[PDB]
Amino acid sequence: IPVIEPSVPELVVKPGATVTLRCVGNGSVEWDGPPSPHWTLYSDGSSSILSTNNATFQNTGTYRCTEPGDPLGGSAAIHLYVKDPARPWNVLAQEVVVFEDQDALLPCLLTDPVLEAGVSLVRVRGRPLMRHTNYSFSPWHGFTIHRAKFIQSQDYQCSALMGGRKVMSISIRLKVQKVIPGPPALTLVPAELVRIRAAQIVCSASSVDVNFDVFLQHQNTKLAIPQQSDFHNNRYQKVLTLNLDVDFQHAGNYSCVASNVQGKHSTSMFFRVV
Amino acid sequence: IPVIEPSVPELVVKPGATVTLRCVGNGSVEWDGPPSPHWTLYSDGSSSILSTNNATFQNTGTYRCTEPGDPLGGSAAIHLYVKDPARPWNVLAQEVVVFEDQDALLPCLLTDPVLEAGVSLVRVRGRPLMRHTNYSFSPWHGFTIHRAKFIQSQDYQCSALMGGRKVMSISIRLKVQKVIPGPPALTLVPAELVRIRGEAAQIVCSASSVDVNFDVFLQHQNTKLAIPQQSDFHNNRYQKVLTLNLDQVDFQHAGNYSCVASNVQGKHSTSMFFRVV
Amino acid sequence: EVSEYCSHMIGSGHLQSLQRLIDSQMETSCQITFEFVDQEQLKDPVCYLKKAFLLVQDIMEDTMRFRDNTPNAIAIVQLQELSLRLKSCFTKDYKACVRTFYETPLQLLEKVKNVFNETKNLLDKDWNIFSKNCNNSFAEC
Amino acid sequence: EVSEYCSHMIGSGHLQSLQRLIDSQMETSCQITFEFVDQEQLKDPVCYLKKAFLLVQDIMEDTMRFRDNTPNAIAIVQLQELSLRLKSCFTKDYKACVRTFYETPLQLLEKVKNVFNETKNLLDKDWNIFSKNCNNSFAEC
Ligand SMILES: *[C@@H]1O[C@H](CO[C@@H]2O[C@@H](C)[C@@H](O)[C@@H](O)[C@@H]2O)[C@@H](O[C@@H]2O[C@H](CO)[C@H](O)[C@H](O[C@]3(C(=O)O)C[C@H](O)[C@@H](NC(C)=O)[C@H]([C@H](O)[C@H](O)CO)O3)[C@H]2O)[C@H](O)[C@H]1NC(C)=O
Ligand SMILES: *[C@@H]1O[C@H](CO[C@@H]2O[C@@H](C)[C@@H](O)[C@@H](O)[C@@H]2O)[C@@H](O[C@@H]2O[C@H](CO)[C@H](O)[C@H](O[C@]3(C(=O)O)C[C@H](O)[C@@H](NC(C)=O)[C@H]([C@H](O)[C@H](O)CO)O3)[C@H]2O)[C@H](O)[C@H]1NC(C)=O
Numbered sequence A: 001i002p003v004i005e006p007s008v009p010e011l012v013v014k015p016g017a018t019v020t021l022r023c024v025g026n027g028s029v030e031w032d033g034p035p036s037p038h039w040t041l042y043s044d045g046s047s048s049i050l051s052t053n054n055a056t057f058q059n060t061g062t063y064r065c066t067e068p069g070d071p072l073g074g075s076a077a078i079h080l081y082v083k084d085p086a087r088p089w090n091v092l093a094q095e096v097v098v099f100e101d102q103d104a105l106l107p108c109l110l111t112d113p114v115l116e117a118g119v120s121l122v123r124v125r126g127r128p129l130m131r132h133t134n135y136s137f138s139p140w141h142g143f144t145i146h147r148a149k150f151i152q153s154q155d156y157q158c159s160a161l162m163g164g165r166k167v168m169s170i171s172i173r174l175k176v177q178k179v180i181p182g183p184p185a186l187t188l189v190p191a192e193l194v195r196i197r198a199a200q201i202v203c204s205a206s207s208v209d210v211n212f213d214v215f216l217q218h219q220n221t222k223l224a225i226p227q228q229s230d231f232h233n234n235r236y237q238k239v240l241t242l243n244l245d246v247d248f249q250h251a252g253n254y255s256c257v258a259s260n261v262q263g264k265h266s267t268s269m270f271f272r273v274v
Numbered sequence B: 001i002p003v004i005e006p007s008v009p010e011l012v013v014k015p016g017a018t019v020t021l022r023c024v025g026n027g028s029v030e031w032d033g034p035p036s037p038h039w040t041l042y043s044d045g046s047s048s049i050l051s052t053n054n055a056t057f058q059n060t061g062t063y064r065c066t067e068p069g070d071p072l073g074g075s076a077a078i079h080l081y082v083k084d085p086a087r088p089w090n091v092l093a094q095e096v097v098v099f100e101d102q103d104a105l106l107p108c109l110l111t112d113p114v115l116e117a118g119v120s121l122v123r124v125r126g127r128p129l130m131r132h133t134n135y136s137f138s139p140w141h142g143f144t145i146h147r148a149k150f151i152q153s154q155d156y157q158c159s160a161l162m163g164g165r166k167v168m169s170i171s172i173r174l175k176v177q178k179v180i181p182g183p184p185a186l187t188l189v190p191a192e193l194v195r196i197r198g199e200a201a202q203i204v205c206s207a208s209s210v211d212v213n214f215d216v217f218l219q220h221q222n223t224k225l226a227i228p229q230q231s232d233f234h235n236n237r238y239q240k241v242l243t244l245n246l247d248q249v250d251f252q253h254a255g256n257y258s259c260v261a262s263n264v265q266g267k268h269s270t271s272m273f274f275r276v277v
Numbered sequence C, D: 001e002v003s004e005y006c007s008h009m010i011g012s013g014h015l016q017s018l019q020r021l022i023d024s025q026m027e028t029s030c031q032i033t034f035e036f037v038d039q040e041q042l043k044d045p046v047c048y049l050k051k052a053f054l055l056v057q058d059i060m061e062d063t064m065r066f067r068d069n070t071p072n073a074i075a076i077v078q079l080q081e082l083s084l085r086l087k088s089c090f091t092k093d094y095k096a097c098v099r100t101f102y103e104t105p106l107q108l109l110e111k112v113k114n115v116f117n118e119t120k121n122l123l124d125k126d127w128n129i130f131s132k133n134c135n136n137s138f139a140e141c
């Protein structure tokens, strides 16, 4: 495992301060951390050095050192705080995407750890968090919304209490996605049919999301049927109803096929004319 | 049928007027009408005469003449209006009782027929009628509320429009009663039951009526059991349920369980059999 | 004559219907004016409910209006029919000794629910409680 | 992200939930204050709905509050999820051009229902209607 000097878990500096992070391994090592300005990098065979003369709030975050080519070597980390009196937040990302019932980390890094007792998570335009929003805060990482829900897909802001006034971070958009298992669930009925030269064929598909197609095709030439669409039991339905008030040219292989961002699904039946 | 003179369907007079109603048939005849003051009665063998010198608003109503010695001979009628400028209403009764879905006549007699174009039925203290109150008016009889409901059991007033101001009759209390068909409806389950001694069993005696005033008890043979009954109001009906729980049955628990319920109508009974193997 | 069935008359089903009606209402800051019995002038629990029961009748007619054939509308009707039956438990007297309120619809509903609930409680303890003359109680107003 | 699935998105089930929510509300004279688009400044049907849809979001959070796990509360949640889905169908650029209202809760509900209903109607005719720039429309305010 590589070794970082200074051997301290974290540093707290003022804007303008000089910071020098040095890492040493057996083989070549490399630093990763916040995409930030004014960093100079010195590297040779066994060691690598990050250094800046003008440390800024954007430099706030965890700096991790690893030795590539050593497998299972592990990493070493150090956290930098640049306590800008004007800028309490270093936002790493303005967009976050997760699925429902996952934790959602909003990566606003606090630039001064003593502020933690007076921080909160809010929405843009001063609106309050959605009802029953389960969340917690870590200085090194930011706010984590626990077991995220679709309803919580909002634009957020990190609030820091400095001299009475609450100072906001830049907005962070959270996308919570419904866990869509696969292609739309099909129901084509009847499975078998045979008539003398009336009949009914209903192609249906249903998913928790609206963004999905469904088509009924005779053979490989799709038919133009207006689809009835309704939302029930927290699910979207899309039904193609074919009415033949029949003949030999109507017989054949009716395939009911529905697609979405997941993929395409298909079910089919046979229609005979005697 | 007896004959009334004057041969007119109705009369309209002022307070103070003299009114004389004469009836004639073959044999004794009799007048009936509003219980009212100042009426003098002259009667003889084939004729009878009502007469007053001081006609008042209370004299307003239908006066019917019948010949009690003729069976099926019929009656003759005439209606009197005494148009008191102060008293538009002659109320015959301050209490009326009917059953649900019956017409309910509130007998406020209008003392002046020209007033009809501007009469209404209202509730006391200025309250408006209940919602969806179907009603109509007849000058000779009063307001009839059609297909009366329990909810309409209220104190009413007859409104007459005279010189801008609405003039009220004395209050009339209407009682609408729920039609209780018969004894409480029973549901005893299970109809059949058989258990092994030591096992468990349950017998629930239940009864339900629109009214709360009804008893229900469950009896083993003819010796009634002491079971605490749960009582609740649901689906606009009162329920009273006796629940028998025997966690540890035996041979003496077997027998003729009768579920019987009573009310002012009568008593209803249903039963089942319990076997122990 | 005041029955022994003065209890068993206000069922739990009645209270559930009220609760569902309350739970269905939108939580809003709007206030409505209505006449109701003053707790200050009537600290007496038995005489408070007596005066309250008379007043809830007008409340349900004037304020608690719902669309025809809706679940809440049906509930109100039943509560009104319930109150007619309850008349034979409350002995007659004579107005006044009451005050104007200005509260949210939910708060008004809570008052009415409290009236029905406590009346059921008291009748369960003794069904002949509300057959007392509160003319003396109605004097100190 | 606008798509051909802008239709089929506002189902009749949504409108039923709204109607049931409306039908459950007590008819009261109380008025509530809220911010909403002025029909006078926006006679344009397409640009009216555009401005309204944004405002309905704040209405459902601030005003349309119901007890947890009640049928109405669930209905509101669904309408809110619906509105998230209806996003990316409405193109928008830079508040204001609106007026304060003082109406009954039922009237507010009718406005919101009308917003959802008419939006469904238009999207059925053409799903790409609300992708027009109303910056010019928002000028005359
Ligand atoms: C420490 O860093 C300062 C900031 O450098 C910038 O900010 C960091 C976070 C990075 O984004 C980096 O890439 C940037 O260059 C050094 O620059 C001086 O710092 C001030 C703020 O403290 C300001 O940024 C100065 O730049 C200007 C500018 O934005 O160009 C100079 C302009 O003349 C001036 N406006 C006009 C029209 O005159 C603006 C405005 O004053 C601000 O934009 C609004 O207040 O500032 C920048 O030169 C700083 O030199 C360095 N200290 C050292 C090396 O000792
Ligand atoms: C026609 O009848 C009038 C009323 O006859 C009485 O009233 C009817 C309804 C029956 O109850 C009957 O049994 C009664 O005898 C004759 O006299 C006067 O008419 C008015 C009309 O309504 C009234 O009935 C008179 O009684 C009062 C009154 O209202 O004037 C009752 C009052 O309480 C009383 N005091 C008041 C007005 O404050 C007054 C007098 O002041 C009393 O002396 C009280 O000290 O009397 C009733 O006497 C009427 O005379 C007769 N017509 C003819 C031509 O005979």
Ligand SMILES: *[C@@H]1O[C@H](CO)[C@@H](O[C@@H]2O[C@H](CO)[C@H](O)[C@H](O[C@]3(C(=O)O)C[C@H](O)[C@@H](NC(C)=O)[C@H]([C@H](O)[C@H](O)CO)O3)[C@H]2O)[C@H](O)[C@H]1NC(C)=O
Binding pocket: A219, A253, A254, A255, A267, A268, A269, A270
């Ligand atoms: C109604 O129409 C559809 C569409 O024509 C029919 O589906 C066809 O049925 C076939 C049954 O043997 C195959 O499932 C076929 O799918 C393919 C494929 O995905 O490519 C067709 C290929 O020709 C076939 N390849 C070979 C070499 O035979 C391929 C193959 O089975 C797999 O690669 C092996 O795993 O399958 C499909 O298009 C319906 O059957 C028809 N009737 C009914 C009643 O549904």
Ligand SMILES: *[C@@H]1O[C@H](CO)[C@@H](O[C@@H]2O[C@H](CO)[C@H](O)[C@H](O[C@]3(C(=O)O)C[C@H](O)[C@@H](NC(C)=O)[C@H]([C@H](O)[C@H](O)CO)O3)[C@H]2O)[C@H](O)[C@H]1NC(C)=O
Binding pocket: B221, B222, B256, B258, B269, B270, B271, B272, B273
């Ligand atoms: C033991 O349980 C049985 C059922 O498991 C009960 O039977 C029925 O109970 C009814 C009361 O709830 C009646 O008493 C009914 O009486 C009869 C009868 O016993 O014969 C029914 C007969 O149908 C009827 N005769 C006809 C027309 O067939 C007969 C008759 O009308 C007169 O009642 C005779 O005087 O009445 C009965 O079958 C028992 O009640 C219950 N207890 C006992 C002690 O048997």
Ligand SMILES: *[C@@H]1O[C@H](CO)[C@@H](O[C@@H]2O[C@H](CO)[C@H](O)[C@H](O)[C@H]2O)[C@H](O)[C@H]1NC(C)=O
Binding pocket: A134, A135, A146
């Ligand atoms: C919020 O998320 C928490 C995830 O760590 C979760 O944790 C639980 O907290 C409970 C109190 O709310 C309780 O004390 C548990 O033993 C603990 O595991 C918590 O359940 C979540 N909150 C809600 C309301 O679901």
Ligand SMILES: *[C@@H]1O[C@H](CO)[C@@H](O)[C@H](O)[C@H]1NC(C)=O
Binding pocket: A026, A027
């Ligand atoms: C350093 O790496 C070399 C080459 O893999 C290896 O031979 C040597 O043993 C390593 N030394 C230590 C101290 O890990």
Ligand SMILES: *[C@@H]1O[C@H](CO)[C@@H](O)[C@H](O)[C@H]1NC(C)=O
Binding pocket: B025, B026
């Ligand atoms: C007496 O009454 C009888 C009824 O049977 C009738 O036929 C007859 O004409 C009457 N006579 C007189 C004088 O009224």
Ligand SMILES: *[C@@H]1O[C@H](CO)[C@@H](O)[C@H](O)[C@H]1NC(C)=O
Binding pocket: B132, B134, B146
């Ligand atoms: C009112 O009475 C008329 C009489 O026929 C009847 O048609 C109507 O249904 C009644 N009640 C209603 C529905 O208002």
